[PDB]
Amino acid sequence: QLRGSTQGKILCFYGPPGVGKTSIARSIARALNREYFRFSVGGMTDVAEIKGHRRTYVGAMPGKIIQCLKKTKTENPLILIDEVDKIGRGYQGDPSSALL
Amino acid sequence: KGHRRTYVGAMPGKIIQCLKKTKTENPLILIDEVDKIGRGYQGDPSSALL
Amino acid sequence: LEKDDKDAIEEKFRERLKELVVPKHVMDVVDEELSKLGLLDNHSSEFNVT
Amino acid sequence: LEKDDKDAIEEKFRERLKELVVPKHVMDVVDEELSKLGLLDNHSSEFNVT
Numbered sequence: 001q002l003r004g005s006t007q008g009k010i011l012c013f014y015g016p017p018g019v020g021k022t023s024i025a026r027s028i029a030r031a032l033n034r035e036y037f038r039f040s041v042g043g044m045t046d047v048a049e050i051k052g053h054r055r056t057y058v059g060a061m062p063g064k065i066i067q068c069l070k071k072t073k074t075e076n077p078l079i080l081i082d083e084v085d086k087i088g089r090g091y092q093g094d095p096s097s098a099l100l
Numbered sequence: 101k102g103h104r105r106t107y108v109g110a111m112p113g114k115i116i117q118c119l120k121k122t123k124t125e126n127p128l129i130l131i132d133e134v135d136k137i138g139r140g141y142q143g144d145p146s147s148a149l150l
Numbered sequence: 151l152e153k154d155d156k157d158a159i160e161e162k163f164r165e166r167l168k169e170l171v172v173p174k175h176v177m178d179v180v181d182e183e184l185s186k187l188g189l190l191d192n193h194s195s196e197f198n199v200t
Numbered sequence: 201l202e203k204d205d206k207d208a209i210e211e212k213f214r215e216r217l218k219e220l221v222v223p224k225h226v227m228d229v230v231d232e233e234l235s236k237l238g239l240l241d242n243h244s245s246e247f248n249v250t
């Protein structure tokens with residue numbers, strides 16, 4: 001409110017499982033009035049889910065973040081990546097670099 | 101989700117067949133073998149299923 | 151005539167974009183692919199991907 | 201004469217090339233690719249790649 005126009009940020013809750021890290025996300029989303037959305041990252045290997053496709057393939061669709069833009073009409077939704085701590089990284093070539 | 105009725109043989113997706121064959125609007129559809137869904141060309145259809 | 155299946159697509163997508171404050175960068179790309187979609191045969195795979 | 205043609209697509213590239221000074225080496229490759237580009241029927245996937 002003091003610095004004019006609305007702005008983004010990043011955060012990282014952490015604590016023992018089942019303590020309510022997730023519910024507060026939905027509550028904060030209701031409090032700030034911006035739209036909510038979430039998606040798991042745990043155990044994924046290929047980057048396409050965060051990154052869509054080249055669309056010369058016969059079956060390509062844009063990556064999930066673009067779907068969330070298609071549903072969440074707002075250009076500043078409260079995305080909630082979750083359970084990064086067990087991010088899938090066993091494949092050759094980290095998807096986590098694309099995440100960064 | 102089904103096809104756009106432009107492609108050959110664009111029959112409606114499976115839910116519509118169940119709606120026709122059961123001839124009533126309140127079937128007890130029963131998904132099976134959910135465990136090994138995913139990792140398609142689209143990543144997975146699970147979002148739409150949800 | 152409601153048979154038009156070319157310029158109907160053009161007007162629909164052009165109308166859907168008006169409300170947004172479109173960046174000029176994307177505006178050029180969407181305009182070009184509209185020009186390409188508006189000349190193509192209705193049933194080619196290129197028309198469906200576009 | 202009026203109305204659109206493929207040579208207009210051939211042209212907008214050429215003009216983009218007209219200002220910057222290309223090395224003689226690549227001055228050819230673009231030449232043969234352009235000369236090939238006109239002869240294709242436009243719906244062939246080869247036209248997309250070229």
Ligand SMILES: Nc1ncnc2c1ncn2[C@@H]1O[C@H](COP(=O)(O)OP(=O)(O)OP(=O)(O)O)[C@@H](O)[C@H]1O
Nearest residue numbers: 014015016017018019020021022023024025082083
């Ligand atoms: N402080 C709290 N007040 C009320 N309910 C709570 C609280 N913390 C947790 N809960 C209950 O726990 C359930 C799930 O909580 P939550 O998913 O946040 O656990 P978690 O720590 O996120 O688990 P994980 O992080 O492993 O997904 C919710 O239904 C919620 O009602």
Ligand SMILES: [Mg+2]
Nearest residue numbers: 018020021022
């Ligand atoms: Mg939880």
